[PDB]
Amino acid sequence: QLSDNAKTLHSQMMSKGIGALFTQQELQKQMGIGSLTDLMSIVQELLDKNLIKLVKQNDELKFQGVLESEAQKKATMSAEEALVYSYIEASGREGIWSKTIKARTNLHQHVVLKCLKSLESQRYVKSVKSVKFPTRKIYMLYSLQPSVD
């Protein structure tokens, strides 16, 4: 069920979620009761409903429970930031540099600029000038200011 398997599948995430490294085989490690498509259909919908969370790393795919503020946050955001903002908030502590997004996101600079301007007004990002040269304007989540010096 959408709500039932959502709330009890959100329960493993809010309780543990097998940390960050949780994969889909780790779901069967906990709940193997769900049939292949039953657990995956509600997976896909809850990401569409911004309830589960996916991370792209290592093998399979990582998953974590949503804080639900970021959920409606990105749901308010456009399709650009929907990946772009989420792709950048996956950069973690060191953030990411602008122009390398184009090769990663397959977009212009003109199209990625204005949404970065929105996130500036949204104040979920901030331009960071680090030790390396100030041609960069690398971006991380405005929530944090970590760096190497």
Binding site: L107, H108, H110, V111
Partner: protein, 50 residues
Amino acid sequence: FLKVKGLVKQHLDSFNYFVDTDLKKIIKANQLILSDVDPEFYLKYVDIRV
């Protein structure tokens, strides 16, 4: 032979074949130019005439 189909028909035919045909090909190759921006746009050629 030469009366109807002419002496110098080489340069004619290939030309007259060009304007009457290969234009309708070349654009049929690229009939759509679309930027990356504003996902609603397109520019669709249809016919060529001289």
